[PDB]
């Protein structure tokens, strides 16, 4: 396999992503440098097979029944359909540039694919019966990184990570309508790597960074150049956009990427790729902070470098480059995919 963006060959799989079957018996790891997907049994923690897909898979989504795995092949500009029981790819559907993420509708009748190409704005829809790409939903700006579907399945959020932009936004889509209802801007943001929904569907979490671009590059202290943040957006009309710090004064979480939401909405799990660790936060303290604060107070609290300690549950040691995380349906275990270490860290959560 090839290292991404290069013609240099490597024997290492380089896991870029991870997910789990809705019955929680199987983990599917997308190997970016392996051009395949690794199957792992949850109970035995054993590799049960490796299924070949197209070039550079960065993402995968499982059907509600768990008979199929839709893998995003980024370099191939395509999406592979994998038979989970047969351990074989049965089709390749062609999509827009660089799918970086994919998710299946609650009814399992539709798959949504975010095309992350820098000049590309698209979310391609795919019927599961036809196993084919129906149409494309054009976003408000370029580079959707990932999508997410609400628990009621009538709405689709898409993080737009837009190159050359200080203000990067999130699009709200009406699934039945298939068009953009609203666009909400996260001010002073860059590198949006994920978006998740709360189980009640009243909030979304988005991991990103806050650059200070208008300032001289002088020191590294007090986040003069970059700070690392998680933003909670209230899904109601006119809802708050709350940018919250992930960093201590002398301790920062470099490049937050993947997110896993507790099934009951108790905790938030964040893969920290630069600092090689999983940051676990208390979501009732976070949401409690959001509900009890105005927009002004939250905007002031974004730069509070002692604030995290209020809602911070833990920071757990991981392998190198934990780009993605996922949870078991009972929420008692969190898995983190490590690219450089070529492995998966298994974490016992606070849930008992």
């Amino acid at each position: 396999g090839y290292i991404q963006g290069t013609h240099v060959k490597t024997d290492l799989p380089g896991p870029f992503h991870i997910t789990m079957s809705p019955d929680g018996s199987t983990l599917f790891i997308s190997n970016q440098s392996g051009h395949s997907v690794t199957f792992v049994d949850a109970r035995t923690q054993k590799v049960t097979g490796e299924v070949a897909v197209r070039v550079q898979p960065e993402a995968s989504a499982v059907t509600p029944d768990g008979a199929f795995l839709y893998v995003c092949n980024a370099e191939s500009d395509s999406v592979s359909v994998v038979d989970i029981q047969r351990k074989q790819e049965i089709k390749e559907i062609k999509v827009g540039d660089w799918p970086s993420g994919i998710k299946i509708s609650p009814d399992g009748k539709t798959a949504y694919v975010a095309c992350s190409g820098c000049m590309w704005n698209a979310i391609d829809v795919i019927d599961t019966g036809r196993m084919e790409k129906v149409r494309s939903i054009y976003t408000s700006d370029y580079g959707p990184r990932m999508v997410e579907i609400s628990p009621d399945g009538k709405t689709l959020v898409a993080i737009l990570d837009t190159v050359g932009s200080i203000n990067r936004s999130v699009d709200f889509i009406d699934i039945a309508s298939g068009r953009v209802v609203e666009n909400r801007v996260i001010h002073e943001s860059s590198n949006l790597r994920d978006v998740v929904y709360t189980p009640d569907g009243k909030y979304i979490a988005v991991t990103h960074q806050t650059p200070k671009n208008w300032l001289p590059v002088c020191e590294a202290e007090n986040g003069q150049v970059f700070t690392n943040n998680v933003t909670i957006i209230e899904t109601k009309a006119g809802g708050k956009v709350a940018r919250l710090p992930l960093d201590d004064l002398n301790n920062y979480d470099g490049n937050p990427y993947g997110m896993a939401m507790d099934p009951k909405g108790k905790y938030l799990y964040i893969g920290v790729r630069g600092m090689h660790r999983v940051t676990i936060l208390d979501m009732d303290k976070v949401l409690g902070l959001v509900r009890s604060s105005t927009q002004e107070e939250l905007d002031y609290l974004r730069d509070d470098l002692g604030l995290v300690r209020d809602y911070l549950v833990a920071r757990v040691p991981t392998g190198l480059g934990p780009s993605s995380v996922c949870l078991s349906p009972d929420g008692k275990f969190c898995y983190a995919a490590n690219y450089f270490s070529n492995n998966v860290t298994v974490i016992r959560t606070a849930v008992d």
């Binding site: 392996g34 590059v217 630069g274 974490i347």
Partner: protein
Amino acid sequence: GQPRVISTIQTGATWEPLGREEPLTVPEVHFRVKHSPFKSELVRYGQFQFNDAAWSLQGSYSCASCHYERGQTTGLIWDLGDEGWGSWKNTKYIRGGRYLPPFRHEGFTGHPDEIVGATSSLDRVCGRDPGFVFRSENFSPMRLEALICYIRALEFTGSPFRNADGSLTEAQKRGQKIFEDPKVGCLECHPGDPMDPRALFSDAQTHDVGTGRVGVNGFRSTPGKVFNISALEAGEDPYGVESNTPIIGLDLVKEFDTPTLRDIYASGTYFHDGGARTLMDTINNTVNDKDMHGRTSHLKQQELQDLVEYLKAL
């Protein structure tokens, strides 16, 4: 209970990064004038050093926070301290970097040092960043060499905007004639052919295209003047904090090293300071002096749009 690590599933083979060893001095970094022989066994280590935030002071960010992680760019515009304050630089697109030396933006003009401007080696770019950007411990020789190996191993993505047949479209074909028109004269500083994989669309030289940002009293004066005509007409705030790109600046040099036009679709916000918000702005004579970058004044909109489409095809 308290969250903890019970086990680790090893799916692939074990891999460990390069050690700390002995950090280079800044003179030792400047001591590497030219590239070392390419080693493809060091490329992954270089990728790690590229994406790692743990090596930095407090772990604030990494290289990938700027040049992103597919190794392209985020389009973020920064003010670095070796070129002067108030002088802005668009984050460099790092795909296909080895094919067009010298490096950075500013060229040979005004740069006898060949470090900040007209950079002789990629080593003098990244090897400097620990002390001039990250403000952290310097790289060891091995880790630096590995990093440079990773950078040199980056290849162009190619344009998505062309037919699955591999051919061009008729809008792009229409634009190619405008591009290669001897009166327009894009081929002069941007020589290349669309079907040629070895085409760099750059002369790798230093030119004055009229993109030099100066003061209200002229070169080496203060404060800066609005170089964006459309933004000046729009009544945009010069010192505004909400803008994606600066409409003002003070440059220490008037001339710059010409970038490749390959993958120009994926560079957020073109030229050096990121004065040009769209491809169209690199043409329409808004953010640059009249006919100092190509002669486009006689062209009008359909032609310009076709030219943009052809640029998207590179």
